Design a protein around this nucleic acid. Sequence first.
RNA 1: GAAACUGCGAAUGGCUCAUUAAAUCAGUUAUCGUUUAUUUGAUAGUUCCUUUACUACAUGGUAUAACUGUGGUAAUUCUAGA
RNA 2: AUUCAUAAUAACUUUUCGAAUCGCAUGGCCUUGUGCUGGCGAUGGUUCAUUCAAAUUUCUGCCCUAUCAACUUUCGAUGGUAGGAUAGUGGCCUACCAUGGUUUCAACGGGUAACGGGGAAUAAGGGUUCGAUUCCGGAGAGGGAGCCUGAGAAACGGCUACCA
Lengths: 59, 134, 260
Amino acid sequence: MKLNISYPVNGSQKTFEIDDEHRIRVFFDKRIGQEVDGEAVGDEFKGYVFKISGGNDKQ
Amino acid sequence: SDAVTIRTRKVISNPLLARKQFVVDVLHPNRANVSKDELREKLAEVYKAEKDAVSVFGFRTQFGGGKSVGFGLVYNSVAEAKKFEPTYRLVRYGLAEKVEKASRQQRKQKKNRDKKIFGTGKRLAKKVARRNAD
Amino acid sequence: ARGPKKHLKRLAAPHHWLLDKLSGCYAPRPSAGPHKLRESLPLIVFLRNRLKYALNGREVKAILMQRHVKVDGKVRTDTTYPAGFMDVITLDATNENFRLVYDVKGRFAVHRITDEEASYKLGKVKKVQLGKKGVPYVVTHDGRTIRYPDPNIKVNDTVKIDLASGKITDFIKFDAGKLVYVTGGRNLGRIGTIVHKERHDGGFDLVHIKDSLDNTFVTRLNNVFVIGEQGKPYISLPKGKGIKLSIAEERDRRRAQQGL
RNA sequence: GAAACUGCGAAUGGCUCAUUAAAUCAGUUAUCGUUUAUUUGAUAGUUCCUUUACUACAUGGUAUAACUGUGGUAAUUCUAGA
RNA sequence: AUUCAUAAUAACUUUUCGAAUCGCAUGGCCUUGUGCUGGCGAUGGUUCAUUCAAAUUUCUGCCCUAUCAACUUUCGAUGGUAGGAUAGUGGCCUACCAUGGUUUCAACGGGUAACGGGGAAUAAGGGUUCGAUUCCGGAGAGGGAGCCUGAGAAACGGCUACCA
Ligand SMILES: [Mg+2]
Ligand SMILES: [Mg+2]
Ligand SMILES: [Mg+2]
Ligand SMILES: [Mg+2]
Ligand SMILES: [Mg+2]
Ligand SMILES: [Mg+2]
Ligand SMILES: [Mg+2]
Ligand SMILES: [Mg+2]
Ligand SMILES: [Mg+2]
Ligand SMILES: [Mg+2]
Ligand SMILES: [Mg+2]
Ligand SMILES: [Mg+2]
Ligand SMILES: [Mg+2]
Ligand SMILES: [Mg+2]
Ligand SMILES: [Mg+2]
Ligand SMILES: [Mg+2]
Ligand SMILES: [Mg+2]
Ligand SMILES: [Mg+2]
Ligand SMILES: [Mg+2]
Ligand SMILES: [Mg+2]
Ligand SMILES: [Mg+2]
Ligand SMILES: [Mg+2]
Ligand SMILES: [Mg+2]
């Protein structure tokens, strides 16, 4: 599923794709606003904290 | 071509529209009605204003021949006709081009097509361009 | 039916305008203003249908928007502005002044007046109340509000209004024997001094009127508009002087003036 | 001067006669029984504060469209995060 | 015709309005501060009046029908009191209380291939028949109900639900 990530300090954005049910899984049952650590989702993101802000489903 | 004779009845000095307005009574024996251009040119040559400031119209020739009766205008300037004249009239004369446009229902449709877009459009050009990958 | 009505089908338009049945469909609906719909003469009508100064309605906006026309003093730019009885219409260009007063047929006549008379107007006072803070006001038939009138000004009296400034400069009481102009009913347009008032508590006072032909009629007090003293109007009257000739008398006047 | 915000309008018009028989409608009344955009005419010296160490009036606050940019859906005048 | 217009007293208010707005012009004034003044008219603004309205409302007037004679209070029918609600009167709604209201001078019920009116047709007169339909009024937007916006809609080229 696509992650649409923003770095509001810089004004940047780029998307990232993930084909890993286990990595993906970390975001499950979390809500908008809840914070999420990085290393789980990818080693790229080791450290990085993400705030979940929204998104679309299929349809 | 036969004496003609152009009369002008019921005349009125009309200062709040910068012109003198009147009826035109054209006798024309042995002449199958006169014409608007001949009448602008002659009424110009009498009201001391010049052709392109005279306006003529209405006009229907009398039953059985002989006479036609119209209506005439004559502005104080060529700048005052060009501003107080209906724009289809200046067209008839040759002192304003017929700016042609699309159909009336071509235009309406464009208005409506345009209603389905919010904002600029080009923002929607690029985003629809990505579909061309999926 | 849901809200304010904005159109007027010609045919429903008031007759004293004299619009032709055909050529269109709607008549101009008078704007909200100083005179009731049904007793008004919109600028469109005056500039084109009476003065013949405009041929189009589109040309009437052309004339107006140059502020050529100005009502009761002020400039005014509203194709269908509700001009009304006693108002004063002015064209600076063409050096022309006008008053709206009635025919004998109950129509608004083209009546030319002097620059001098264009100074002022006449207003029937329609109510006199005590305003907020104890300031007394009068209110005239054309809906002007005027603060601090003379105490002896009561309802139905007529009033000479400055125009240039809003103030009052005179008032004629409603007494037996005072020049009157009739503003409604059949007797609309007639003129005649006043004989006597039928009181009638709680429902329409009748005003018996006689003119300068020793002819007599009657209207509701609502329809009666004082304008001075017998002999002495306070404004110039139209030719006719509001005397009403029989259909016979009118026939003869028109066929006595026959030889070109 | 596009776009967008703001304001106003979309309660007029046009169409039809299904319902409706004291209803509607007509003529005639009433508001000392109320609402009223607008037009027109009037209409406002007072706003702070235990009232000498004083209050932005030379004019106080952000949050948003359009926009830039990242996106979602087969699909609409759908719209999300930044 | 009023407890009216208007004003005065004691207070009350999640305190309404009392211009932080825009355009053309740029001039006067002396203690020379970029001081102090100041032209035309836009948009706005509270209250009142006016105008365009609206909403209710008085009196009288409707086609056929008794093989419709009694009708009205189930769960307001008719009135009184107080309140609530409304823009506001009012059983409009709710409490309490009472027993009223309409009818052979045809109530109540049924029918209408019934929207009303201005009008139309037919020509001795009296009448008879018609009016979906150019103007006025009313109602509706497939059927019902609900409501947002707003000065104004119970709006449908508005939304919401149910039914088709
Ligand atoms: Mg077009
Ligand atoms: Mg657009
Ligand atoms: Mg109008
Ligand atoms: Mg009365
Ligand atoms: Mg309509
Ligand atoms: Mg905020
Ligand atoms: Mg009081
Ligand atoms: Mg200066
Ligand atoms: Mg039966
Ligand atoms: Mg019996
Ligand atoms: Mg009661
Ligand atoms: Mg009970
Ligand atoms: Mg009982
Ligand atoms: Mg019977
Ligand atoms: Mg029917
Ligand atoms: Mg009909
Ligand atoms: Mg009928
Ligand atoms: Mg039918
Ligand atoms: Mg409706
Ligand atoms: Mg249908
Ligand atoms: Mg139903
Ligand atoms: Mg609806
Ligand atoms: Mg509609």
